[PDB]
Amino acid sequence: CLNRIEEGTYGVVYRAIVALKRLSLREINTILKAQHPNIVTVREIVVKIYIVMNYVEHDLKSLMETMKQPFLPGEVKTLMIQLLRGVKHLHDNWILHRDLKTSNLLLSHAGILKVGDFGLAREYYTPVVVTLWYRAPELLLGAKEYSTAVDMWSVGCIFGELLTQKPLFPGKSEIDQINKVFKDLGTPSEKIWPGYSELPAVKKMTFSEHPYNNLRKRFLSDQGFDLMNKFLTYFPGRRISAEDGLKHEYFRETPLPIDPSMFPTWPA
Amino acid sequence: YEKLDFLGEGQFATVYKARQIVAIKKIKLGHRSEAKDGINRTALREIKLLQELSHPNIIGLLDAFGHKSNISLVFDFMETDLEVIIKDNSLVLTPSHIKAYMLMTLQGLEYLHQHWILHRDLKPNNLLLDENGVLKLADFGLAKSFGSPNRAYTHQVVTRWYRAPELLFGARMYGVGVDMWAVGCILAELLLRVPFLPGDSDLDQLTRIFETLGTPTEEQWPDMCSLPDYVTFKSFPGIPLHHIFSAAGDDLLDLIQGLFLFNPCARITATQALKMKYFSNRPGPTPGCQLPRP
Amino acid sequence: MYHNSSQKRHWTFSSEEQLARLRADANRKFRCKAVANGDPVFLEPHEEMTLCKYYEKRLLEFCSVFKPAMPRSVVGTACMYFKRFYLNNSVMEYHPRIIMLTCAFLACKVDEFNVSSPQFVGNLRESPLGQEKALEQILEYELLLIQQLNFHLIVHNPYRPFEGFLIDLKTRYPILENPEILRKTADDFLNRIALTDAYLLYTPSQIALTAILSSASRAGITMESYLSESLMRTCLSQLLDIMKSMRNLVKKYEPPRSEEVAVLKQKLERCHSAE
Amino acid sequence: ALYEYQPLQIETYGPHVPELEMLGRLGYLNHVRAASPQDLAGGYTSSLACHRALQDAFSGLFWQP
Ligand SMILES: Nc1ncnc2c1ncn2[C@@H]1O[C@H](COP(=O)(O)OP(=O)(O)O)[C@@H](O)[C@H]1O
Ligand SMILES: Nc1ncnc2c1ncn2[C@@H]1O[C@H](COP(=O)(O)OP(=O)(O)O)[C@@H](O)[C@H]1O
Ligand SMILES: [Mg+2]
Ligand SMILES: [Mg+2]
């Protein structure tokens, strides 16, 4: 071991170049089942239990914290392409990650985004998952069942963070998070959201009404707005998927996705 | 101090036995930004708090040796926790046992609150039982002093199961009530052997609280709306207290109701709780040597 | 509370003789250690006291312009830590500058004044290299200060007792028309008590009462009736004698001399460079 | 073995401070900052601040090392 890169609640990672994460069966099985170029590649398993991974130089959140100019649209689009490929590979393997955030996203010098942190991933459930700043409204309102829409929301929020280098909904509290989502997007309705009244939170609580589609003032192309609204579709069954998002016309625009190799360098 | 056994690991630190038999809690460094801070703030807080405290029902800090990297604390060996007693189905909890546990907890909190200090982390596994059945509070990482209208700390301190509605509604400033509610929850657990309000989400926790004890009104909470995280609720009738705890007597029902008022100011304190008729009523609380042992 | 606290049990002394003998013991111990390691370069204990007073004033100035604003409790705790550390240690071993910096850092940590290390050193009038070097020395010496304080990290200051006595005078003393006009001057007197070693000899309640009564006497207002009746014969005499000793200590204190502190600083740098 | 409450007693080495329940009766709370309704919601009253100030004012006032 060389140095502890960061500390975690249920696992701590050291640099050695490889990464040695000390922690169980759920995480290792999920990480093994999803080998991919855009997914953290486990090299071997050693014994406390340790997992050896291919070392990446940086993560997305650290890069955002220590850089002043905004992201250029081309590398945003390239990172979205890589993220969508990864989440679609996870979906094909019947894997729900539920822990998609900029901290988990790892970016190397070669411009390759390689997701990890499979502690919260499961085979498809658990009522309370996903961080508050990226959790979907369905799990916020106590939905006992959920699907790929929970990862789709996290991807959309990560896109919103990419656009402005600031979290879209950094709610101080769960009630504050719900209020922020309702204010920025507009409160849902039964006509907009079928099965609204069935949600446990609405049955036992009351919220405030807000005008619809207030997120546009915060920010992106018109096709970018269409794809963003595809991320912020309230209805879980209507929300777009990664496969269709890859097919969207926003990925073919004037700032075409630059290749991963042409990435401006940053301190290591 | 010859390390001889491993006693578990948490998020704050790692604890292990040593030869009188003691337990060392060695603190691991925090995050990357927290590694540059030096000695962990939780460890320093606990050091000062247990250095200024002395009571038979408060855990005793003995030594705080360490090195440059981090710090390590030493405490008396604490045989078991209260959560082990509760979760063990082979242990029958007679009303005298509940009375004795509540008495020890309330006396410890009385001494703690007299010195203007809030535990803010009350829950059964934090109450440690020794080989002589002397319950002692522990895990003073979140313990902070109260009384001065100058320092306000995060409301998200207690775990979701034992969090008072004043904390759940996002209160900057609070008093002893945030402890008392937790005590009541512990009491409820001792009466049911299962968590009283085992909510998964904090909003679900609020729904469980209001479904069990009824939605509060402006009569029982004069300034409930004033809180910033206040959320409106539907008026649940609330299960009557005697239905939830059938075997508990009238005095125990009054004690539970007092511990479970929605108004933190009107919620009974440790001194008031010890002065209720329940503790002086027959039967007498069990001694330390007669408490159940796994 | 103070009446059962580590400060009362360990860090309050009978008189200045104990303080002088402890400081002389520390100086002699360092001299013996140096002579065993392998004569005119060692400074006398009074010179050590002069340097300690000068760098305590420097720590006061540091905490005065600190950003974010330092609560008075934090600076009081820092000064108490400085006095406690240098009561049993020698300036010839550990440099006063880094020790006062680590005292301020530990006071910030203990008093729940959350400031990050880069934020903590952004108030330093040094180069960025100087700031990061100061950071490493502070991190090195924090545990040393912790160990030298006997892990007694809670310090009771006279500001809260001063507020309490002001409130009590407001409510239970109709004779005094307005105690508020007696605050500011007392505050100034409190500052003087900070400079001397009265923090190591008398409890904060006595210090606050002495400051209030000195402010009252300076304005000509006499309130012996407050002590006699409102506060309800040996006890009153002892309190009066304690106040007299406080005023004598305040009068007797002498500020540092510029040429003297310059010479002492040069000598101290010589000792630290040599070993 | 029954139980009957004994008020725990520790010497403050100073003048007696009034009991918490009755500070407002003598007008002690008149000379403090009134607690805002947000603090009252969480169970914080100016009585606590006044009592803490008075308790720390009279603590150790009569002590001789
Ligand atoms: N292979 C790697 N390359 C770069 N950074 C890594 C790598 N593995 C882990 N990390 C760092 O470690 C952190 C993840 O810690 P993690 O193991 O998720 O802790 P926990 O699982 O307890 O939350 C991330 O912030 C990331 O920056
Ligand atoms: N004084 C003590 N004597 C013996 N064992 C102890 C003592 N204090 C703590 N322990 C053990 O060490 C472990 C500490 O973990 P814990 O404090 O629960 O972590 P966290 O606070 O992060 O949940 C507990 O499981 C407990 O059994
Ligand atoms: Mg992680
Ligand atoms: Mg514990």
Amino acid at C87: L
What CATH number does residue B226 fall under? 1.10.510.10
Asked if B287 lies within 8 A of D49 by C-beta distance, the reply is no
What is the CATH code of the structural domain delimited by A3-54?
3.30.200.20
Q: How large is the greatest C-alpha to C-alpha distance in chain C, in angstroms?
A: 69
Residue spans in chain A of domains classed CATH 1.10.510.10: 58-251
- Residues 204-223 of chain C with CB under 8 A from chain D are 204-206, 208-209
Q: Are residues C169 and C102 in the same domain?
A: no
DSSP of B174-235: --THHHHHHHHHHHHHHHHSS-SS--SSHHHHHHHHHHHH----TTT-TTGGGSTT---B--
Q: Is residue B197 part of a domain?
A: yes
Q: Are residues C238 and C270 in the same domain?
A: no
Domain boundary among B21, B53, B76: B76
Amino acid at A88: K
Say which residues have a Cβ less than 8 Å from residue B242's Cβ, sequence separation at least 6: B248, B253
Contacts with B172 from chain D: Cβ below 8 Å: 38-39, 42
Q: Are residues B109 and B244 in the same domain?
A: yes
Containing domain of residue C40, as a range? Answer: 3-155+255-274
Chains A and C are touching, with contact defined as 3 or more CB–CB pairs separated by less than 8 Å: no
- Residue for token digits 């006699």? C228
What CATH number does residue B13 fall under? 3.30.200.20
Q: Are residues C127 and C168 in the same domain?
A: no
Total structural domains in chain C?
Answer: 2
Asked if C109 lies within 8 A of B150 by C-beta distance, the reply is no
DSSP letter (8 states) at residue A43: E
Task: Give the whole-angstrom CA distance, residue C152 versus residue C11.
Answer: 9
In sequence order, what E strands does chain B have?
Answer: 3-9, 13-18, 22-27, 61-63, 72-76, 80-81, 117-118, 128-129, 144-145
Q: Are residues C200 and C212 in the same domain?
A: yes
Domain boundary among B76, B99, B130: B76
Q: Are residues B21 and B91 in the same domain?
A: no
**Which residues of A are the active-site residues?**
99
Paired sense of beta strands B117-118 and B72-76, if any? unpaired
What CATH number does residue C101 fall under? 1.10.472.10
Q: Are residues C165 and C225 in the same domain?
A: yes
Considering just the CA atoms, what is the radius of gyration of chain C in Å? 20
| Cross-strand bridge partners of residue B14 | B9, B26
Q: Are residues B37 and B152 in the same domain?
A: no
Is any Cβ of chain B less than 8 angstroms from the Cβ of D38? yes
Q: Are residues B71 and B90 in the same domain?
A: no
Q: CB under 8 Å, gap of 24 or more: what pairs does C263-267 form?
A: C264/C43, C264/C47, C264/C50, C264/C51, C264/C54, C265/C51, C267/C41, C267/C43, C267/C47
Q: Are residues B113 and B258 in the same domain?
A: yes
Q: Are residues C149 and C224 in the same domain?
A: no
Q: Are residues B245 and B101 in the same domain?
A: yes
On whether the CB atoms of residues B141 and B121 are closer than 8 A, the answer is yes
Amino acid at C4: N
Is any Cβ of chain B less than 8 angstroms from the Cβ of D9? no
Number of residue pairs across B and D with CB atoms under 8 Å?
Answer: 85
Total structural domains in chain B?
Answer: 2
Containing domain of residue B66, as a range? Answer: 3-76
Resolution in A: 3.5
A23: tokens are: 């922690």
Q: Are residues B141 and B246 in the same domain?
A: yes
Instruction: Please state the length of chain B.
Output: 294
On whether the CB atoms of residues D52 and D29 are closer than 8 A, the answer is no
Q: Are residues C241 and C260 in the same domain?
A: no
Q: Is residue B103 part of a domain?
A: yes
The CATH fold of domain A58-251:
Transferase(Phosphotransferase); domain 1 (1.10.510)
Asked if B67 lies within 8 A of C153 by C-beta distance, the reply is no
Domain boundary among B45, B76, B107: B76
Choosing from B15, B17, B24 the residue with most ligand 2 atoms within 8 A of its CB, the one to mutate for a pocket test is B15
Q: Are residues B70 and B134 in the same domain?
A: no
Amino acid at B234: K
A118: tokens are: 């499979």
Q: Are residues B85 and B192 in the same domain?
A: yes
Q: Are residues C37 and C87 in the same domain?
A: yes
Q: Which of C14, C163, C206 sits opposite D53 (nearest CB)?
A: C163
Say which residues have a Cβ less than 8 Å from residue A112's Cβ, sequence separation at least 6: A37, A38, A82, A260
Task: Give the whole-angstrom CA distance, residue C111 versus residue C159.
Answer: 15
Residue nearest atom 23 in ligand 1 by C-alpha distance: A8
Asked if B223 lies within 8 A of D41 by C-beta distance, the reply is yes
Q: Which of D13, D28, D64 sits opposite C171 (nearest CB)?
A: D28
Q: Is residue B292 part of a domain?
A: no
B289: tokens are: 């040597």
Number of residue pairs across C and D with CB atoms under 8 Å?
Answer: 80
Active-site position among B81, B121, B139, B179? B121
Q: Are residues B10 and B116 in the same domain?
A: no
If DSSP codes are grouped into helix, strand and coil, which group holds residue C215? Answer: helix
**Nearest-CA neighbor of C49 among C91, C94, C110?**
C91
Q: How many CA atoms lie within 13 A of C195 on its CB side?
A: 18
Q: Which atom of ligand 1 is nearest to the CA of A11?
A: 22
Asked if C154 lies within 8 A of B36 by C-beta distance, the reply is no
Residue spans in chain A of domains classed CATH 3.30.200.20: 3-54
Q: Which of B34, B211, B233 sits opposite A205 (nearest CB)?
A: B233
The three-state DSSP-derived secondary structure of A69-123 is: CCCCHHHHHHHHHHHHHHHHHHHHCCEECCCCCCCCCEECCCCCECECCHHHCEE
A165 dihedral zone (left: phi>0; alpha: psi -120 to 50; beta):
left
If DSSP codes are grouped into helix, strand and coil, which group holds residue A4? Answer: strand
Task: Give the whole-angstrom CA distance, residue B79 versus residue A191.
Answer: 59
Q: Is A156 annotated as a binding residue?
A: no
B114: tokens are: 């007299």
Q: Are residues C82 and C133 in the same domain?
A: yes
Q: Are residues C36 and C83 in the same domain?
A: yes
Q: Are residues B130 and B169 in the same domain?
A: yes
Ligand 1: which residues within 6 Å by Cβ?
A 5-6, 8-11, 13, 19, 21, 53, 55-56, 59, 103, 106, 117, 119
The experimental method behind these coordinates is cryo-EM
Residue B31 Cα to chain centre, angstroms: 27
Is any Cβ of chain A less than 8 angstroms from the Cβ of B227? no
Ligand 2: which residues within 6 Å by Cβ?
B 7-8, 10-12, 15, 23, 59, 75, 77-78, 81, 128, 138-139
B131: tokens are: 């080989």
Q: Are residues C39 and C116 in the same domain?
A: yes
Distances (CA, A) of A225 to A81, A193, A221: 17, 20, 6
DSSP of C55-104: HHHHHHHHHHS-SSPPPHHHHHHHHHHHHHHHHHS-TTTS-HHHHHHHHH
